[PDB]
């Protein structure tokens, strides 16, 4: 209402009550004019490799992105969550846009001037029928910034469709976003909508205190037998004789078991110590990849697998983990001290190590003159009796992904981590309404190319309720907790420096508490 | 006008011979309707709940689902060695993937399963 | 002869499904180091993995 | 000999597509020909000249 | 319109693969005097114009 | 300057055609191209590549 | 009303129901 | 039949195994699969079936 009344108030806090926590984040955003109000066909460059070809469209619209956990949880909030809860999941969200300001920019005479345009509008619509290509869930920049005092730029919306090389095909779709209905907002108007999450499984924010190969009573023998010797000493040599034993603690690898470890898709191993790696360019040639319509894509991060085995923390899968950048890290070819490499070590209780074989299978039929032969299994699809953990989530990491619209999707938990949703939180798209500049006094049928330079700013609030599954642990000894480091330092972790720059010093997962298998 | 096909069935075989578990079925051991000129036969059937057949094609590919205008905040290993003097030395380097290296982007999904066929030309 | 038969085309599902005559992808087969280069292998049979999506075969008149 | 009737009800999921540009449709060929596709010939023989799938419309992933 | 003959001269008969068949081609079973009705193809129900109407306008059917 | 909206309701007479063989439909072309028909180019210019009439379906006299 | 309130919203779409279609265009 | 087997120690080297956190475990019995094909009842999978002891059987190398 009017011009002198704010359309909303600042809400940032977390409310912990019972099995629920509610997070609220308010930020200040700025929206420019994109593409000078045009839709543009875009494509890969002429010299691009086949694996890098694309075709699509850039739009004049922007969109809002709060699909990272930091956007909602403070570092102290994240600690409170991960130290006390076995699981959590999102329930509902609220979204608000308010305190909208449109401003005119006159760059005349090399001097910039900025004035309020109290009459201009912004257009906002939710894609609640999921009729546009969903580009959230691709881990793009442009989120609400983790620190509440920071002002962020709204990212530009674009999408890809079917390409053959740099060219489109008959099935390529083009979308005009102005062909949707949208709200027009003038200074003093606000925008709200609500969303309910579908029923989704809790994220498992624990590690297992048991391993899948150690589930039996070590004090008692099995009543089942296994083949323990295939020959026996006969005089001066051996002869073929099959012999059988019941497995106890002494031969614990040989016990009959009910379950199998999860599936595998083997990754190459790289060392954080530089001298242990081969002196060669293998970042692509040695990469784990999939092949789709004659194209190779890197499998990154791929299926959830343990980063390393015991005492090998310096090793990680080539493209098998999420890697976050440190504050101020650049885009291209940075050193390893500039990035933060997550560790999925916790899931090695049930999941194969990413850089090892799944196991060994028999390849032949032995006999008197043929010895038994085995082969390493480097790729293992799911088997009946397999169990596994999903990838962990991080404070820096994504929250949800849209499950692709397909006939079949096995265990549709997104591989970068988080909650797979058939109807995710809808895309919220926004743009400044074009305001034409001074027209000619003689009619012209050509479209207007001359506009008044404008941008918008405002406040955005996002409120998410999360359902908690509290830890109820009967173990006697104390557990592992996330804690801040104990010593003195120049800067405090998760703080601003003397220049006002907020930084996140390390990745924080969720799995600190333990449970039995 | 069409001819009604003859009914037959197979059971367990060992070579051309049956086994102990082979089953034989007399169909006249079922109750049936007997119809004379002027009699008719009807029955109804309800299908179970089944998923719709997808009578569309996709206008997007699974490896092209991101916003081409924005970079990822995640990093991938982009170089494993670097020129050192007259040769190279092992040095791990990392990049954020954009549109220029779109094959290297972190993704959430995998293509469906495979069981490879031999290729023949028309 | 081939002119006597009609061969269907499942080309539409290549957006999500592997091409029938190609490998699914490549996996690492060894542990590299200073004196060992990284080696990969083609995957010619791939069982279902968590995170896979696919289309079913089309129907015809 | 006799007559047989079969009656099937099918549930439809209608296309609700927001793309701007027109789509691919199945259409009969445009030119003249000796016989019409999906017709009898001069001898009374019905023929089906090609396979027809279902996937002409498009959707996003 | 259908026509139904007498099959097997009213007998059930044991049938099997021929003696010289490969192992991959062995079978054992029974042929019956009965016939059966088969409408498990789409053409049996949809006309070509009907099939066009279906596939141009619908994202799914069942 | 301002915004203008125009909303028109149209009454339809649906095709109810008993012919056996499939009909002519308007369809987008099948092949690859630099630009898509009825789209913007790399410079943002929308174009209409051809005229489209209404008469694709058929009826008897 | 006033100066800070938009007098309308953007409507573009087509609604197909029965024997009717409704088109809306905003420019 | 003892004479059809290789004279060697393959009970572990030739065994079907899985690999978890740098450890090898025997896959026993593993996924459900047929013990043998037709007329091969004397053959069985190395660790692919349940093996029970007769009354009074001992623990080790019977």
From Swiss-Prot, chain C:
Domain remarks: The N-terminus of VP1 is sequestered within the mature capsid. It contains a phospholipase A2-like region and putative nuclear localization signals.
Span of the entire protein shown here: 553 to 613 of 735
Protein species of origin: Adeno-associated virus 2 (isolate Srivastava/1982) (AAV-2)
Record function comment: Capsid protein self-assembles to form an icosahedral capsid with a T=1 symmetry, about 22 nm in diameter, and consisting of 60 copies of three size variants of the capsid protein VP1, VP2 and VP3 which differ in their N-terminus. The capsid encapsulates the genomic ssDNA. Binds to host cell heparan sulfate and uses host ITGA5-ITGB1 as coreceptor on the cell surface to provide virion attachment to target cell. This attachment induces virion internalization predominantly through clathrin-dependent endocytosis.
UniProt similarity note: Belongs to the parvoviridae capsid protein family.
Miscellaneous information on this protein: The ratio at which VP1, VP2 and VP3 proteins are synthesized in vivo is about 1:1:10, which is the same as in the mature virus particle.
Membrane spanning stretches: none
The protein's name in its UniProt record: Capsid protein VP1
Practical use: AAV capsids serve as viral gene transfer vectors that have been shown to affect long-term gene expression and disease correction with low toxicity in animal models, and are well tolerated in human clinical trials.
Compartment(s) of residence: Virion; Host nucleus, Host nucleolus
């Amino acid at each position: 209402d009017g011009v002198g009344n704010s359309s909303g108030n600042w809400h940032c806090d977390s409310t912990w009550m019972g099995d629920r926590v509610i997070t609220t984040s308010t930020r200040t955003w700025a929206l420019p004019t994109y593409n000078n109000h045009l839709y543009k066909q875009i494509s890969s460059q002429s010299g691009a490799s086949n694996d890098n070809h694309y075709f699509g469209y850039s739009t004049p619209w922007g969109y809002f992105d709060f699909n990272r956990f930091h956007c909602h949880f403070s570092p102290r909030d994240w600690q409170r969550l991960i130290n006390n809860n076995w699981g959590f999941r999102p329930k509902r969200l609220n979204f608000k846009l308010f305190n909208i300001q449109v401003k005119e920019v006159t760059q005349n005479d090399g001097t910039t001037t900025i004035a309020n345009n109290l009459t201009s509008t912004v257009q906002v619509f939710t894609d609640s029928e999921y009729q546009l290509p969903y580009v959230l869930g691709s881990a793009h920049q442009g989120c609400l910034p983790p620190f509440p005092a920071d002002v962020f730029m709204v990212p530009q919306y674009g999408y890809l469709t079917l390409n053959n090389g740099s060219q489109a095909v008959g099935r390529s779709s083009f979308y005009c976003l102005e062909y949707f209905p949208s709200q027009m907002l003038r200074t003093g108007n606000n925008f709200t909508f609500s969303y309910t999450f579908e029923d989704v499984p809790f994220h498992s924010s624990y590690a297992h205190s048991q391993s899948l190969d150690r589930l039996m009573n070590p004090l008692i023998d099995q009543y089942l037998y296994y083949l323990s010797r295939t020959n026996t000493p006969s005089g001066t040599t051996t002869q073929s004789r099959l012999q059988f034993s019941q497995a106890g603690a002494s031969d614990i690898r040989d016990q009959s078991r009910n379950w199998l470890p999860g599936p595998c898709y083997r990754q190459q191993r790289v060392s954080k110590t530089s001298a242990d790696n081969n002196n060669s360019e293998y970042s692509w040639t040695g990469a784990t990849k999939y092949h789709l319509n004659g194209r190779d894509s890197l499998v990154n991060p791929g299926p959830a697998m343990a980063s390393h085995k015991d005492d090998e923390e310096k090793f990680f899968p080539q493209s098998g983990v999420l890697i976050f950048g440190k504050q101020g890290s650049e885009k291209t070819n940075v050193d390893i001290e500039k990035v933060m490499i997550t560790d999925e070590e916790e899931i090695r209780t049930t999941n194969p190590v990413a850089t090892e074989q799944y196991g060994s299978v028999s390849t032949n039929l032995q006999r008197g003159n043929r010895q038994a032969a085995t082969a390493d299994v480097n790729t293992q699809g799911v088997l009946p009796g397999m169990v596994w953990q999903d990838r962990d989530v991080y404070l820096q990491g994504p929250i949800w992904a849209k499950i692709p619209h397909t006939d079949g999707h096995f265990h549709p938990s997104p591989l970068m981590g988080g909650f797979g949703l058939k109807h995710p939180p809808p895309q919220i798209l926004i743009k400044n309404t074009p305001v034409p500049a001074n027209p000619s006094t003689t009619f012209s049928a050509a479209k207007f190319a001359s506009f008044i330079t404008q941008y918008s700013t405002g406040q955005v609030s996002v409120e998410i309720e999360w359902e908690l599954q509290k830890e109820n642990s009967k173990r006697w000894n104390p557990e592992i907790q996330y804690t801040s480091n104990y010593n003195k330092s120049v800067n405090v972790d998760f703080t601003v420096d003397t220049n006002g720059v907020y930084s996140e010093p390390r990745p924080i997962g969720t799995r600190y508490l333990t449970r039995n298998l």
